[model samples]
Every structure is written in C-alpha cells, then in structure tokens.
Target chain A: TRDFNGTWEMESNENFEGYMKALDIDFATRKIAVRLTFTDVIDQDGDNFKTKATSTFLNYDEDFTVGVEFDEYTKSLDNRHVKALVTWEGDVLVCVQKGEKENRGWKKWIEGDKLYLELTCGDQVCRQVFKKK
Target chain B: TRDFNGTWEMESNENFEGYMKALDIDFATRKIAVRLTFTDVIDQDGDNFKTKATSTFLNYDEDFTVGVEFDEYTKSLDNRHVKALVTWEGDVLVCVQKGEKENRGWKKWIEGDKLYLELTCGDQVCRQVFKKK
Candidate 1:
C-alpha cells in the first residue's frame, strides 16, 4: 500500500459544480464550493482510514474500514444518506457510494508528486488535483 | 515583501498547551486542541491579508490590513474579544492583541522554505513550525 499519509492542497478543480448539480446540491452550496479550494488530510492505518476534506465554507470528515459497508450521512454537504464502501484497486483508493443517486463514487490516487481525485455522480465527473505537502 | 500565497502544514508545535493554559481556556477545549495539528493557508495582496488556521476539530479565519487596528473576536478558540493591530516589523508579520491579557501577541515569519509562528500569552510562548506546500 502506498503511504497516502500527508496534507494535500487543491491545485485545480474541474467540473465540480457540474458534479454537485448532478448530486442535486443547491445553488448556494455549489457556488461556495466552486470558488473554495479544499485541503485533504488523510491517514491510513492498515484497513481503517481517516480523511477530512476542509474548505473555508465547510468541511467533511469520514472514517471507514476497507472492504466493509458503512452508512454515510453527508450532513453538512448534501444531507443525504448512503451505504458507502471503500476498496483499494492496485494503488488507487476507490469508494462506491450506493444511494438513491446512481453511479456515485470517488477515486483517489497519487502519481509522482501529485494526488488526483475524481468525484463522480451519474455521468458527471469532477476531476481535481492536489499537491502533496 | 514576499507573497505568501500557499498552504502550510504543521511541522511542530511546542508549549501550545501551556500557552492555552495561560489564556485560561477550558480543560475540555485545551485537551481537544492540544492533539490537533493545524494547517495554515495564507493569502496576501499588498497590505491586506487573509489567513486561516484549520484543524479537524476547529477552524478559524481572519482578515486584516497592515498597520490598522481592528476588533478581533476569537470566537472559536477562546471566545474573547480583542483589539488587534498588525504591523510589519522587518520581515516579520507582528500582531499585537490588546485586551485583558498582558503581552498577548503573535509573530509569523518565513525563513527559507519554512514558515514559523510564535504565539504568546503573558510570558508563555508557543512556537510552531510549518512546511510549505
């Protein structure tokens, strides 16, 4: 397993507003999220992982065990409930969010010195890049 | 003047708990705060500055202009009100927080690739080091 245990700052975000629109996020939240740069601090300990995505307007933290299904409540962001499962595909950390929304998932991977995240909702894909600390 | 327009993660925090103690912060808050590693994101445009200290538990953002005294309320950390004046002392960004506490101020400076902060309350000084992202 690659050590994805550092602070990452958002270098670029593409189609994030479109992804949020697909998720039915309100305009107020989507606009604020679009303009804000997010930072992710992640820690991995064997099968269990802790990650927090922080921005100036809001933040979200999640704790989940690999390959285990858990209930995820997006309280601050979307206020939706979903069954979430995370698994490692080679060097990529993939999460499947099974809920009323279809094809909702996210992928995180590192290439060289940069971290890449792809947030998916329906067919919309929001690609984001982060620089490692 | 250097443009400090990037994210910085905590490298070390020394005597922070002691400095909080001198401020008479609650034990519950102190315990939670002492365990947190903060990331500082700073943006400066001429004499105006925007800075945020973010952690998983709490986050605080402040906007200030150089050499101007402004009313600052520490809503998240201590819930206290103070009159703050920020001035550039050579390369150091120095802030004098005038309130109930004596000799309460902070200093932030950049040396090489690292950023350093010295937070003071009374005679206690909590020194922190941060690495640029």
Candidate 2:
C-alpha cells in the first residue's frame, strides 16, 4: 500500500503562471499566486483519501475514494464544475478531471521524500515539486 | 527577524467545521474541508510574506506585507470582501479582516517547531496546529 500520509511543502514550480492563465485566472490573482509557495496535506485510508490546500489567501479541500467518480466544483481557481476520478497507475495517483476544459487533470507521485505534481489544463502543464516533512 | 520559512503540516484542528459554517460554506464543501489535513508553506522575507495552501481538491495563495493593509476577496470560502491587515504583535502575526462579517480575523505564531493558527469568524474560532518539517 502506498502511504501518502504526510505534509508536503512546495519547493519549486514550472510555468504556474502560464497554467493559471490557461485556466483563465485573473491577472491580479495570478500575479499573487505565481509567487506563493503551496503546502499539501494528504491523508489516505485504504482507498479513501482527503487532501487540503490552504493559505492565507484561499483554500481548496477535496475528498474522494479511489476508482470512484465524483463531482467536483472548482470554487476559487476557475469556478468550474467537473467530474473527477482518481486511480492508481502503478505507484502514481492519477486523476482525470472531465470538464469544459480539454485535458484538465493532475497526477501525483512520490519519489524518495519528495512529491511530484503535474497539473494539466488545456495544453499547458504545471510541474510542482514538494518536499515531505 | 522571525523567519517563518519552512513547511508546516497540520497536526490537529478544532472547530474548523464550525468556523466554515460561520463563513457560510455549504454542507458538502465543509464536510470535505474539515476532514482534510492542511499544509502551510510560509516564505517570509522581512515584512513581506507569501503563503500558499495546496490540496488535491483546492488551493489558496496570498502575498502580503506586514503592517500594510490590502483588499482581499474570499472567492470560495465565503464569497465576500474583506480589507485585511497583518501586524506583528510580539512573536505572533496578527491579522484583522474588516468587512461584512463581524470580528473576522486570524493569528499565527510559532512555538518551537510548531506553527499555530487561530481562525476566527463571527464568534467562532478554529485552532490549527502544524509541525515544521
């Protein structure tokens, strides 16, 4: 069983501003967002997982069971609704967010004590790195 | 200078659900948010700080200067407007959010390697503890 039960802090990001622009985040918000460091907390109980992204400016929380499709509303990021599904491909946790946007999804994997996240929107991909604490 | 430059993961939470309720977060969103652990990445350069909260579900990112007030719009949490100000009170970072809600604010401080955050809305208060990595 893969254990993703720790706190992870953002170490680096690649073209997050471009990805945010692809999501149509406002200029002002994207300006602030690109310079911020994100923290991810993940809890996995068997196939059920809960994750929360919190900062002083905004927060996003999600809950899902693996291999089960669920409805998700992107409240602050894009204000869009989508059907999200999570599944494990090898050791990677891959998510498919079926929505208005094309190729909108994310994948997460752990390498050593580091976590790698790849966020996809349209044709832009944002790569984020986090170190486990 | 107090350097809050580290990754902090949520250890525990108190009354977060109640605090979300006070902010008028829907029952469904609150359910997910309360159960998820939160991680905070704080980058403090003198009085300027950038914090980002990231989860698989959602994310919030903010940048601010200490003792300087700024306008903030709570997009998902309450969908409201607030004028925010952060100042250092001894070793604690105290924030006051003035707007539609009464007594809305938060405070953060460090004890040893633990980061303590207290969120307030209306008369409700939520306490969150995070251990440094």
Candidate 3:
C-alpha cells in the first residue's frame, strides 16, 4: 500500500509556461505565475485521496477516489470544466482530464523523499519536483 | 534605489486557506493550492518593475511602475479585476488593489535575505515568507 500523507514543498518547476500557454492563459497571468512556488499536502486513505496545492496568490484543492471519475471544475487556473479520472499505474498515480482541451492529464509518484508531478496539456509537459517537509 | 531583482523561493505560508475562501475558491481547487510552493522572479529597473509568481499548478505576472495605477487582472489567482497601485512606503513596496472585494491588497518587503509578502482579501490576511535563491 502506498501512503502519500505528508507536506511537500516544491523544489523546481520545469516548462510550466508552455503548459499554461497551451491552456490559453493570458499574458498578464503568465507573467505573475512564472515566479510562484507551490506546496502540496496529500492525505491518502487507502483508495481515497485529498490533495491541496497552496500558494500565496491562489490555491487549488482536489478530492477523489482511485478508479472513480468525477467532474472537476478548474477555477482561477484555466477556469474550465472537465471530467477527471484517477488510476494507478503500478506505483504511479495517473490522472486524465477530459475536456475542451486535448491531451490534458497529470501523473504523480513518490521517489525516495521526493514527490514528482508531471502535468501535460496538448504538446506541452511541465515537470514539478517537491521534497517532503 | 531599492532593487528587487532575484529569484525567491517560498519558505512558509500563514493563514492562506482563509484568504482563498474569501476569494470564493471552491473546495477542490483550494485543496490542491494550499500545498503549492511559489517562486518569485523580480526585475526592477528604477521605478519600473516586473514580478512573476511561478507555480507548478498556475502562474501570475505583473508589471508596474512605482506610484502608477494600473489595471491588474488576477486571472489564475483570484480571477478578478482590480485597479492596482504600487508605491514605496519607506523601504517597503506596498501595493493596493481596489476592486469589488473590500480590503484587497498586498505588501512586499525584503528583510535580510528573506522576502515577505502580506496578502489581504476581505477580512482575511495571509502572510508568506520567501528566501532569496
């Protein structure tokens, strides 16, 4: 059983602009967003999971169960509606968001003391690394 | 001649959830955003400046001149429109955001090697600390 219950702080974010642009984020938003650091707190209870992404400017929270599909509304971040589904691919937790945008999804996995999050939209992919705090 | 030109990483966040809720962010998005680490890249040339708040989940950017009022659209942060004005209050860079929401603004300053950001929305205020990178 994989347990993702801890506080994680971001170490680095790679190619985040490309992903934001793919979602058609405007220039003003992109300029302020390029310097933000994100922190994640994940609470996992067997197949039930709740993850919180926090920053000074904005915050996003998500709750889901493994293999269960739910409607996800992204506010302040793209502001779109999507059907989100989560699944386990071996040790990795993968999520697919079906919506107006094509090929949008994210993958999460823990490696040693680091949590890795890979976000994808269209042809852009952003990789984020966080260390357990 | 205050120059805020550097890359800063988030160190801590205080009372952030309350601020998010005041902005009307839903539960799901707030959960994911509470754990985000934000990095700020600031480029200052005299009174003209640009600040980018970068995160793995979302990003925000702003450019302004000191003592000048600008129309700032907080796309992914609050998704609101505000008239923003930046000024130097002693050694501190203070920003006031006037909009539909009452008491909305932020204050930023550098202490030693740390950068402090105070975010206010409605009756809630969130404090964030960042270290120069």
Candidate 4:
C-alpha cells in the first residue's frame, strides 16, 4: 500500500508452475503463464486497488478495495471461487483468499526500488519475484 | 556498453531549464519540460539503440545505431538542424550533434547504482539521474 503506483515488468519467475499445479490449473493455463513474462499496470487510490497483469496471452485484471472482503471468481485464470480480503500488514499488502484450496494468498511489498510479489497456494509457492519499472 | 537495457526513472533534474534556455527553447515549452519528470525505456541490441523519453506532456523517442552519423531533424523539442552521431566511448554512450549550436551533445554513463546523463547545449549543461527499478 506504499508507492507502488506505477507500471512494472516482471523479468524472472521462479517456481510459478508448481504454484499453479497446487491450484489444480489445467495445462493450457499453466502453459502461457510459464512461457512468458508479465507487465503490471497498478493504480491505487486511497483504499481502492486496480491492478492489470498484462501478457501476450491474456490480461488478468484485478479490482478490489483494501480492508474490504469481496468475492472473486479469479476471472479466467483458475476459477478460484474465493473471498479475498486484502489488508496492509505493516508495510506488506497481504491477501487472504478463503477458498477450497488451503492456504492460498498473495503477498506484495516494495523493497528498495523493486516491487516484489509472492504467490502461495497450498504448500507450493513462487519465490517473491521482483518487478522493474 | 554495459547492461543499460532496462526501464529507468529519472527523479532528479538539475539545471534543466538552463539547458533549455541555452537551446533557445520557447518559454511555454520550457515550462512543461521544467516541471515534469520522464521515464526512459531503453533497449540496446548489438549497436542499435532505442531510448524513449516518456512524459505526460510529450514523449521523445531516440533511435540510432552506434558510431553511425545520420541526419536528425529533432522533430519537436529543438529545431536546431543537425547531423547526429552516437558512439560508445569506453563504457559511456556519447552522442555528438553537429549543428549550428557549437559543443552540443549528450553523454550517458553508469555511475555506482545510478544512471548519469549529461546534456550539453551551447555552453550550458544539464544533469539528470536515473535509478534502477
């Protein structure tokens, strides 16, 4: 929730496939996610959040408010069918997704000049990948 | 000639207005250039260089091959008719603009953790800083 209002591009990805496998995502969805990089267009106004993950295959748009829990079908990514509550814990933005999948959430924070995002599902996790602007 | 192949944000602009004044830029044009910061999207392939200066008011794009002298009209910013040549001088990217205005060129190099750009017009010079994101 601090100074991440910019366009970001993710260059390196670590263990994203395992994170998707834990979500039970099919081959096609994982195929695109693994093969390419993503650029993020993020806008934060007060407590509102608008983050667009841009890729050649698809653009996954996320819209929600911080500290307010809302239902999210995850659009076309995973059909997560979950209720997500994004909250600012200290300096980190943590999303707690209550769904059939156990322990699934994303943690985002800014360190130094880089934006870092970590995706976690069940026991699988993606190493906090850094984004450049 | 190093890894200057990423997106960079220039947060500090020192003596930009003076540099513009030396170039005989109009007052209205100098107003916007003085008040705004720019984002640089740089791509270097072999000796080909593509450096885009992105701002809210305008976007100035630079594309040329290193060590090649070419005619550049400089579209909008400055109407000083010139033939420009960009070449790699050691670890620095140096551009020599042969125009009516003497001693005009730009020097870009990496220093510590920051990107340094020195723009010279006539007898005045402006310095800008680009930090990695």
Candidate 5:
C-alpha cells in the first residue's frame, strides 16, 4: 500500500472552476488556478500519509497519521479556521472539520482512477472530482 | 421581498444525515437529529430577516440584512468563527461564509413549494430541501 505514496498529477478537474469562482477568487487567482498544475505528494507509512497539494502560487499541506489530530488552515481559501481529523472508513479517507458551518465537513474517496471530494457548508453542497495522472 | 418569511418545515433532507455523520456527530446526536422536527422562523422586513431554526435539542439563529455583513457563530455546529454576508441573486438567497473551508458556502432558494439549500465545506458538498409551511 505504500506504493500509493508518490507525487500525483491532476489530470482534470470537474466543477472546480465554478467552485473557485463561487469562493470569490480574484481574477488573477482564477487565471493562475486554471493553468496551474497541481502536484500532490503523499508520504505513506502503514495506513497513514502526509499529503501536500502544491502549485506554483499556493500550497495546501496537512499531516494526518490516521486517527491523529491536526489543524487545517485553508489559506487563500475562504480562510476559515478549523480543527481537523482524518481517518479511514473502509477504503475511503474521511475528514471531519470542526468549523463555523453547521453540518460542515468533507469526505474523500477513491473510485477507479478518480478522487472524489464532497464539501458541505451549512445547506449548500458542492462536489468536485479529480482524475489522477 | 418579505413574502419569503414564515415558519418553514423541512419536508425532505437530502444527504443531511450523511453530512452530519461526516462531521463526527455521535450516535446520540444523530438519533436526536434524525427524529427531530426542524422549525425555521424568518422575521422579514424587506430583504432583511432574522432567521431561526429551533428544535427541542438545537437552535440555529442568524440575522442578515441583504447587502449587509454580520457575525455568525454556529454554536451547535463545529464551533468556528465566521463573518457571513448574504445577498440576493435573482430570487435566491446567496450566502458567502468567510471561514476556513475551501469553496465553503451555501445557497438557498425556493422551488415550487420547496425550499432548497446547498452546503459546501472544502470539497464536500451536501444538498438539502425543505418545504414551506
């Protein structure tokens, strides 16, 4: 399973552009985002990994050794503060974010060659699916 | 503009339990939530209203005047800090939460006799629809 640890490229994004715009991303950021290549590095040890999403202009990194506590700062995002915990539900990596939005959090699952993410904030829901390369 | 004010009841909750469970809501909380009734009160004056969701065990209160900014603390929620601003896009109530989750926000609208809500946090999205009473 450690073989899953590597730098994966984002081949395509489904509905991420609209989500970015909905977040009030500036035009420059949007321009950067559309053309930016996302490099995801996964460091695996046993059933846990430290994941980092890096681009030319931004970086989102978090460490979770499965069943551990971590602070997730979504800088350049809506900029909300949250205490996050990640664990596995079967084969899926589920993340629970304690934040301001009621019923707010995310779930990540892998199906075939795609990574699916579900975002919840209050009553609005937006889903994004990314294909791995 | 005040035509939308009333005690709206949730007719159908689409993916609400899943979203709540993803937030790490315990079994007791989930039991209380699944069987509870949601009563939403909206005191509207023009495009502004103080909305409250009340139940036996939980209550969510928020005051928003269109085009105005307000402080929102989801106490029973994950308990994070957020500056929220709500406005009208056509007939829909659009909310942008200034917080930590990426693409984190929600949208509320009415279709037929049903009220629709979309919740987003990070990459997880959940959609819920309520009925007007």
Candidate 6:
C-alpha cells in the first residue's frame, strides 16, 4: 500500500504568502504565486521515486529511495545544496536535509482526496494542500 | 584588495574522514577522496564573485553578487528543490533557503587561520573546519 505514484494538484495554501515574504519575494511575485496552480508528478519504481513539481513560474524535480542518502538542490527557490535522506514514518514520507541552516526539511502525506506538504526554512513554516486529480 | 571578507579553511580535517562521513559518502569514494587535497579558486570583483571547489573526485562551482539571486545545484548532491538567496551580513557570507525543510541553510566565515562551515538539518547540526594553504 505504498503507492504514491500519481499526479497531485494543489487546491489550497496556508501561510504561503507570509513564508514568501520572509524570503523577500516581491509583491508582484507573491500575487502571481497565489493564483497559480501546482502540479506534482510522482513516479515510483520499487522503493525509489522521482517527484517533480511544475508550475507556470518554476519547476523542481528530485529522486530518492526510502533510506538511501542523496544531495538535494532546489531549482527555482533559494537554490542551495544540501545532503538529504528520506524515510517512511508510518504512512508519511519524511525527509531530513543537512546543510547551512538549522532545523530544515519537509514532510509529505496523503489523506482522502487531499495531499499535504509542509515547507520549512529557518523559523518560518508553510503548509500547502493539494487535491487529487 | 581585502575583498575576500570571510573565514575559510579545513583546520584539522584531522582527516577527510569526517567530511566524507558527515555527508554519508560511500566507502569506495572516500578511499579515493581522502588521498586528494582540495583547492578552492575564488575570484572577487567587489560584491560579485565566483567560487569553485575542486579535487580529484569532485568539482563544484558557484557564482553570485551580494544580495543577488542564483540557481544552485550540487552536481554530486541528492538534487532537490530550493530557492536560495545569499547576502552579506556585515562581512560574513550568509545564505537562506526557502524550501521543504526547517532551519536549513549555511554560513561561511574565516577565523585566524581556518574556515568554518556549520551545516544544519532539522534539529541536527554538523560543524566543519578547514585550514588555509
């Protein structure tokens, strides 16, 4: 039952504007981001997976195995380098990144017809929700 | 020109063992990497500069001007999505990442004869020190 191999569409977002503000994203960019939709493509083979996020403004792709370690770089967001290793905690996918900032990483999960993502950088946190399409 | 405004070096790498271990570098790769020394080529024109970390096994290059944005992808890292912005906090190089994770980012500073890098990931932190050549 580890099947997370489908496309998920973003339905609603919370605190995304504030999080972008902390990153110094300008007013125009913020307005556009709120109205834009996100598409996340996930492909899984055995225990390895490649996840991609596509939008009108930016794109991000990443691949990893459940416990295998790898390095990660954000394509459009503050593109910094970090070592990442992902694991499954219950039914949730949890990732830990070792890099320059303190307390960084993300978590992904699906509940009913919705997908959830929590993005954290420094002390700011944002929760994004996506609907199944 | 005293424009190279930060602390840098790999003091007492003791051995490259720690660097490789901290990154969870594989055994075969570490065997080769430990034998080679790294040289960082840095060029600075006021607030803009290019930096490259090179060795027999890996090569990494990054360029940016103070307060400017750039896309970064670590060639040998577990590639992921990140938006990075680097600026000068006084004289030290400071970077902040906006992405999936909490308290993630890095800082570079120079001490008397060494370079200091503190790597942080979700509640875990690793400190690396390098000596100057």
Judge candidate 1 against the unseen true structure and give its global Cα lDDT, from 0 to 1.
0.70
RMSD of each: 19.8, 18.8, 18.9, 22.8, 23.6, 26.7
Candidate 5, overall lDDT? 0.63
Best by DockQ: 2
Summarize candidate 1's per-residue lDDT along A2-67 as a digit string, tens digits: 888989998777899899999999876665565367889999897678999877433345556567
Residue B37 displacement in candidate 5 (angstroms): 16
Model 3, C-alpha of A112: deviation from truth (Å): 0.5
Task: Classify candidate 5 by CAPRI docking class.
Answer: incorrect
lDDT of 5 at A53: 44
In lDDT terms, how accurate is model 2? 0.70
* Clash count, candidate 1: 0
Error of 3 at B74 (Å): 25
Which digits, one per residue and each the tens of the lDDT, describe model 4 over residues B18-64?
A: 54444344565556555555555556553234544455334567789
Instruction: For model 1, state the Cα shift of residue B109 in Å.
Output: 0.9
| Per-candidate iRMSD | 19.2, 16.3, 17.6, 22.5, 20.5, 22.0
Tens-digit lDDT track for model 3 on B38-120? 66555545434354555654345667899889998887576788999999999998988898988889999999999999998
Candidate 5 local lDDT, B69-106, one digit each (tens): 77777542345678877776877767788887556677
Off by over 4 Å in 2: A1-55, B1-133
TM for candidate 6 is: 0.31
Model 4 lDDT per residue over A41-64, tens place: 988887788999876322244455
lDDT (10s digit) by residue, model 3, range A24-120: 9986677557646788999888889999988644435566666778888874466679998877787776889998777788776656545556667
Tens digits of per-residue lDDT for model 5 on A1-133?
1133455554444454555555554555454455444444545454333444444333456657889878877765677888888888998777777887567778889899999999877888889999999
Instruction: Tell me the tens digit of each residue's lDDT in model 6 across B58-119.
Output: 34567777677666664445466667788888767778666677777788899998999887
- Regions more than 4 Å wrong, model 5: A1-133, B1-55
Off by over 4 Å in 3: A1-56, B1-133
How do the residues A110-132 of candidate 2 rate in per-residue lDDT, one tens digit apiece?
56555556667765665556654
| DockQ for every prediction shown | 0.02, 0.04, 0.02, 0.03, 0.01, 0.01
